[PDB]
Design a protein around this ligand. Structure first.
Ligand SMILES: CCCCCCCCCCCCCCCCCC(=O)OC[C@H](COP(=O)([O-])OCC(O)COP(=O)([O-])OC[C@@H](COC(=O)CCCCCCCCCCCCCCCCC)OC(=O)CCCCCCCCCCCCCCCCC)OC(=O)CCCCCCCCCCCCCCCCC
Ligand SMILES: CCCCCCCCCCCCCCCCCC(=O)OC[C@H](COP(=O)([O-])OCC(O)COP(=O)([O-])OC[C@@H](COC(=O)CCCCCCCCCCCCCCCCC)OC(=O)CCCCCCCCCCCCCCCCC)OC(=O)CCCCCCCCCCCCCCCCC
Ligand SMILES: CCCCCCCCCCCCCCCCCC(=O)OC[C@H](COP(=O)([O-])OCC(O)COP(=O)([O-])OC[C@@H](COC(=O)CCCCCCCCCCCCCCCCC)OC(=O)CCCCCCCCCCCCCCCCC)OC(=O)CCCCCCCCCCCCCCCCC
Ligand SMILES: CCCCCCCCCCCCCCCCCC(=O)OC[C@H](COP(=O)([O-])OCC(O)COP(=O)([O-])OC[C@@H](COC(=O)CCCCCCCCCCCCCCCCC)OC(=O)CCCCCCCCCCCCCCCCC)OC(=O)CCCCCCCCCCCCCCCCC
Ligand SMILES: CCCCCCCCCCCCCCCCCC(=O)OC[C@H](COP(=O)([O-])OCC(O)COP(=O)([O-])OC[C@@H](COC(=O)CCCCCCCCCCCCCCCCC)OC(=O)CCCCCCCCCCCCCCCCC)OC(=O)CCCCCCCCCCCCCCCCC
Ligand SMILES: C[C@@H]1CC[C@@]2(OC1)O[C@H]1C[C@H]3[C@@H]4CC=C5C[C@@H](OCCC(CO[C@H]6O[C@H](CO)[C@@H](O[C@H]7O[C@H](CO)[C@@H](O)[C@H](O)[C@H]7O)[C@H](O)[C@H]6O)CO[C@H]6O[C@H](CO)[C@@H](O[C@H]7O[C@H](CO)[C@@H](O)[C@H](O)[C@H]7O)[C@H](O)[C@H]6O)CC[C@]5(C)[C@H]4CC[C@]3(C)[C@H]1[C@@H]2C
Ligand SMILES: CCCCCCCCCCCCO[C@@H]1O[C@H](CO)[C@@H](O[C@H]2O[C@H](CO)[C@@H](O)[C@H](O)[C@H]2O)[C@H](O)[C@H]1O
Lengths: 57, 87, 383, 106, 53
């Protein structure tokens, strides 16, 4: 009725602070590991060159 | 404003306690008496110093109510007794 | 789970059939254990067979060493099948509880009958053989899962708090592993990220140094009876034997890929015996397979290569993390619009409260300026 | 050149890109009053981080699909110098193809 | 032909975006809850039992 309640009350602030920091850490990780991926596609010049070769030119 | 109590402090000064970092600091440089943000926190100097927060009427931009799905957790168990019920 | 009259009737009706089934299972499990023990004594390492002594560095108290006193029989499939091992494990649990009850009966004579009535009214400590139908078995499994939910969080919190209060991780990867190890079951933990915690805790506490209170919590979470607990080297032996059997079965399955061919109910039971899949979650085959693969990944390549599993304390914490449900939160957010201290409104504010409101209210700056100016004037006059 | 067509992957959920964009707009609209102003070198807020991640993913998907809005792609998807160079490369190519098609038609 | 090639990846990206949205929504819910708790705390009508619940 008296002791354990008081010590729980004393614990509350530190735990709240640490959990807030942990959540911030996880969202920070979410944004950190995002990168824009630029894909590379076969240049159409080679396609045009192959078309010319097929024509026997 | 009302006369209600606030988060208990134990008669401690949060600017010098061992867990001071857990208490946010306001613009005036006075650490809060609670994990919440307090703008008008003060310190009184008796034989020992102690922090005090005076409730006041302040308006805060209220984010709209979310859906129950995203904050309710129905993991209650028969042994579980909530703090309100315990009180 | 709390006792009930319906469960009391169920267990009273199935008491004698349950005892007969338990006796048959006892004969079968004795045969299986005889095979396993003969194989261990014949092909086991010298340290494992001779029961090498490992003493703590502080009080020199002997306890089982994971490296020396635990051995994975890679060639056990020749003599004993996976199903036989699972049967032996289940019978070991049932026999432990029955043995404790029988010891109480022998100790107290005929005065244990009302305590037996309390016992049969709950499925927590009755053997699985007392259930003769699917619904009864489901209720029994629900009771076991409830006990696991009740007990595991205490063990996890004990471990985490002691480590965090008396030590900190060495490097960032260890920090991430430690933080992610104790996440709630609503999120999926990556075993590769979490594995280094095993080595870190080996640096902190090995299985040979496990404290008696943490052992009690673990045995509670494993549905192992704890009264009389006695010395820590008895339930510790029980835990070592159970996890040694589990590791042998896991090696068999990994090598032979039995879990892919394993059926849905058998797969669910296999996960449950590893404390990975509660029955109340109603998991499907995909989720069970994901959890089992994560468990195998956490064991790591070294388990197959040499039969060496990671630190048992961290392994138990990891697997029991699936019973660490998110903290319950019930009630609409509108409830936050109420007030808690309305009953004090009639009292009003006394002189000291009015002074505090005046000094620390919106007029605080004006009051501070006036007070400081007055004090400065008085000090100047004094000088 | 590319390779074997990648193995078919079943979506874990059904939802349209338009629906996702509408949901994102709804989510970010309720926090507009709370949302705060910051400089480039100042630390960011939760709302700003969520907005950046969501918009980045949305506009990356749109770029891969072919709905090239170069202004929005530039704002939300372009964070690195190298990525900016690549965006400039893309911008020239699309305009060149448009001009070539128009004159080939004319 | 290009659409067939960029098929698994686009669907995976869409699913990941949906999962990210579902992951972010609870954070905003918690932020709103903390805002309301702070509002009541500043009024002196917040009990520690309510805060813990
Ligand atoms: C209603 C019934 C009432 C009952 C009353 C009787 C008492 C209770 C009964 C039992 C209750 C249940 C629980 C008991 C404790 C369980 C402990 C436990 O968990 O052990 C696990 C443990 C199993 O673990 P393990 O891994 O297999 O082995 C342990 C490891 O080695 C561990 O490794 P380690 O690293 O820890 O190694 C250390 C370990 C090593 O020890 C062991 O573990 C080995 C086993 C114990 C060996 C003990 C014998 C040592 C040699 C004795 C030599 C005596 C010579 C005297 C010659 C005299 C000539 C004149 O421990 C020691 O070193 C301790 C040594 C003992 C020191 C004793 C000091 C006494 C000081 C006396 C002061 C003065 C007294 C008053 C004055 C008297 C004179 C006037 O069990 C044992 O080892 C043996 C357990 C034995 C239990 C007790 C059996 C009771 C039998 C009762 C019979 C009589 C009944 C009378 C009834 C009367 C009417 C009602
Ligand atoms: C009539 C007089 C009565 C005297 C008073 C008694 C007062 C009550 C005290 C308790 C008595 C025992 C109660 C029955 C237990 C059931 C049998 C048993 O041991 O189960 C195995 C099981 C072994 O546990 P564990 O942790 O797996 O053992 C680790 C070993 O490494 C295991 O080794 P492992 O890994 O190599 O595997 C071996 C395993 C492999 O086997 C299997 O896997 C197959 C299954 C075998 C076990 C099946 C057990 C079935 C239990 C249920 C029975 C049906 C109950 C039905 C109830 C309803 C009835 C209507 O086989 C075993 O379990 C063999 C264990 C060693 C034999 C122990 C028995 C020794 C005493 C009997 C001989 C007495 C001869 C007297 C000669 C007199 C000369 C003058 O026993 C227990 O669960 C332990 C008992 C739990 C309660 C402890 C309570 C405190 C005890 C303090 C005693 C202190 C000394 C006495 C004085 C007390 C004063 C205060
Ligand atoms: C036919 C059947 C088949 C054959 C038989 C088979 C064998 C059967 C036997 C074996 C069964 C084993 C399994 C049993 C499981 C159930 C155990 C149990 O009780 O569970 C709690 C059980 C309920 O269990 P549950 O609801 O299922 O919840 C289980 C949960 O999992 C909760 O689980 P938990 O783990 O949280 O609960 C555990 C809890 C268990 O404890 C409790 O829950 C406490 C139970 C009692 C609570 C009482 C509250 C009410 C008090 C009322 C007071 C009087 C009011 C006014 C009455 C006015 C009347 C006119 O705590 C403990 O475990 C503590 C253990 C303490 C051990 C003490 C050891 C002392 C050793 C001494 C020191 C020695 C040192 C060495 C010295 C050596 C020297 C040489 O409690 C009850 O049902 C309460 C019954 C209350 C009865 C009425 C009040 C007492 C009446 C007394 C009448 C006296 C008449 C004569 C008077 C004469 C005057 C001259
Ligand atoms: C606000 C006021 C309210 C009222 C207050 C009332 C006043 C209280 C004042 C004082 C209170 C504190 C007293 C403390 C004393 C010192 C304790 C101490 O040193 O403990 C050390 C130590 C601590 O225990 P532990 O094993 O470390 O863990 C204890 C935790 O509670 C284990 O917890 P856990 O969570 O790890 O495990 C939970 C679960 C785990 O589940 C299991 O383990 C499975 C189920 C196990 C069933 C039991 C198996 C027993 C196996 C054999 C044990 C050895 C027998 C030895 C020979 C027999 C000796 C008699 O275990 C249970 O649920 C246990 C159920 C037990 C129910 C009975 C509890 C007592 C209720 C009262 C009944 C008796 C009333 C007699 C007086 C009235 C007569 C008219 O005790 C032991 O080593 C245990 C030895 C047990 C020996 C037997 C009992 C000896 C005492 C005499 C019995 C007399 C019977 C009379 C029959 C009727 C005659 C007419
Ligand atoms: C309602 C009330 C009614 C009246 C009640 C009257 C009460 C009388 C008050 C006086 C009683 C004092 C004794 C209290 C015992 C409880 C202490 C306790 O729980 O401490 C927690 C304590 C704290 O542990 P922790 O802090 O969690 O962890 C620290 C360590 O990590 C732990 O790590 P660990 O477990 O590895 O290390 C410990 C272990 C390490 O060692 C081992 O593992 C090796 C074990 C070696 C065993 C050696 C046994 C030698 C036996 C020789 C017998 C030869 C045969 C002779 C036959 C003919 C003569 C009869 O060594 C031991 O603890 C065993 C030491 C030797 C045990 C001897 C048997 C018990 C004697 C009790 C009577 C003492 C005199 C009483 C009168 C004077 C009082 C001032 O844990 C333990 O000590 C665990 C073991 C507990 C076993 C003792 C209790 C067994 C149950 C008794 C059953 C009989 C019930 C009778 C009921 C009577 C009712 C009237
Ligand atoms: C801590 C509290 C204390 C009080 C209490 O609760 C716990 O203690 C508990 C302990 C309880 C007794 C325990 C055991 C029996 C025997 C049983 O007997 C079966 C029927 C026959 C045997 O089958 C009876 O036939 C006998 O057969 C014997 C040969 O086999 C003959 O010799 C004997 O003469 C002859 O009668 C009849 C019930 C009774 C008396 C219980 C009553 C209730 C309690 C007093 C409880 C009670 C509520
Ligand atoms: C009241 C007491 C109750 C006791 C309950 C438990 C009883 C258990 C009995 C187990 C009997 C096992 O039987 C025993 O097994 C061992 C190990 O395979 C055999 O051991 C044999 O092979 C081993 C291994 O190569 C050799 O080290 C040993 O020298 C040789 O004898 C024994 O020859 C056999 O007798």
């Amino acid at each position: 009725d008296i002791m354990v309640p008081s010590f729980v009350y004393n614990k509350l602030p530190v735990i709240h602070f640490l959990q807030e920091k942990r959540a911030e850490q996880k969202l920070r990780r979410v944004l950190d590991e995002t990168y824009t991926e630029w894909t590379e596609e076969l240049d159409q010049a080679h396609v045009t060159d192959a078309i010319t070769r097929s024509l026997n030119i | 404003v009302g006369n209600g109590p606030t988060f208990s402090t134990g008669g401690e000064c949060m600017n010098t306690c061992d867990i001071q970092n857990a208490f946010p600091m306001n613009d005036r440089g006075v650490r809060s008496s609670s994990p919440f943000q307090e703008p008008n926190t003060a310190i009184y100097d008796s034989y020992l110093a102690w922090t005090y927060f005076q409730p006041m009427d302040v308006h805060i931009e209220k984010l709209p109510a979310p859906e129950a799905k995203y904050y309710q957790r129905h993991t209650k168990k028969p042994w579980d007794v909530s703090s309100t019920e315990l009180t | 789970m709390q006792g009930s009259w319906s469960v009391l009737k169920k267990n009273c009706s199935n008491f004698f059939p349950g005892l007969l089934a338990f006796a048959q299972q006892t004969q079968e499990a004795y045969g299986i254990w005889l095979r396993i023990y003969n194989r261990q004594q014949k092909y086991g390492p010298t340290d494992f067979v001779e029961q090498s002594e490992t003493f703590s560095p502080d009080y020199h108290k002997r306890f089982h060493s994971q490296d020396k006193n635990m051995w994975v029989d890679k060639e056990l499939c020749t003599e004993v099948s996976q199903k036989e091992v699972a049967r032996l494990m289940t019978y070991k649990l049932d026999m432990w509880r029955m043995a404790h009850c029988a010891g109480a009966l022998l100790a107290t004579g005929g005065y244990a009958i009302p305590f037996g009535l309390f016992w049969l009214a709950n499925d927590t400590w009755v053997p699985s053989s007392f259930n003769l139908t699917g619904e009864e078995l489901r209720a029994w499994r629900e009771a076991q899962d409830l006990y696991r939910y009740r007990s595991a969080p205490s063990y996890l919190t004990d471990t985490k708090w002691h480590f965090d209060f008396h030590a900190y991780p060495w490097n960032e990867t260890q920090e991430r592993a430690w933080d992610d190890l104790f996440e709630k079951n609503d999120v999926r933990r990556d075993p590769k990220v979490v594995r280094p915690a095993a080595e870190m805790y080996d640096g902190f506490i090995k299985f040979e140094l496990i404290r008696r209170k943490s052992l009690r919590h673990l045995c509670r979470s494993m549905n192992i009876p704890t009264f009389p607990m006695l010395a820590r080297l008895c339930n510790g032996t029980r835990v070592r034997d159970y996890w040694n059997l589990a590791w042998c079965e896991d090696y068999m399955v990994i090598t032979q890929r039995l879990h892919e061919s394993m059926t849905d109910e058998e797969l669910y039971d296999y996960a449950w015996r590893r404390y990975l899949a509660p029955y109340d979650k109603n998991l499907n085959r995909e989720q069970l397979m994901e959890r089992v693969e994560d468990y195998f990944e956490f064991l790591g390549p070294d388990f197959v290569a040499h039969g060496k599993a990671p630190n048992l304390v961290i392994l138990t914490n990891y697997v029991l993390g699936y019973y660490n449900d998110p903290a319950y939160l019930e009630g609409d957010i509108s409830e936050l619009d109420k007030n808690d201290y309305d009953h004090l409104a009639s009292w009003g504010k006394d002189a000291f409260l009015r002074r505090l409101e005046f000094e620390n209210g919106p007029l605080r700056d004006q009051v501070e300026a006036h007070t400081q100016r007055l004090l400065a004037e008085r000090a100047a006059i004094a000088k | 050149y590319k390779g074997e067509v990648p193995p078919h992957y079943t979506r874990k959920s059904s939802a349209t890109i338009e629906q996702v964009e509408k949901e994102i707009d709804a989510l970010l609209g309720g926090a507009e009053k709370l949302r705060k102003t910051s400089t480039d070198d100042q630390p960011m807020d939760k709302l700003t981080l969520m907005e950046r991640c969501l918009r980045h993913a949305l506009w990356s998907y749109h770029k891969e699909e072919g709905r090239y809005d170069f202004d929005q792609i530039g704002r939300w998807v372009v964070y690195t110098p190298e990525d900016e160079v690549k965006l400039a490369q893309l911008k020239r190519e699309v305009e060149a193809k448009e001009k070539l098609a128009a004159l080939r038609k004319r | 032909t290009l659409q067939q090639y960029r098929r698994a990846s686009q669907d995976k990206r869409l699913d990941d975006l949906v999962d990210l949205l579902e992951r972010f929504k609870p954070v905003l819910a918690r932020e709103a809850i903390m805002q309301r708790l702070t509002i009541k705390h500043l009024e002196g009508q917040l009990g520690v039992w309510r805060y813990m619940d």
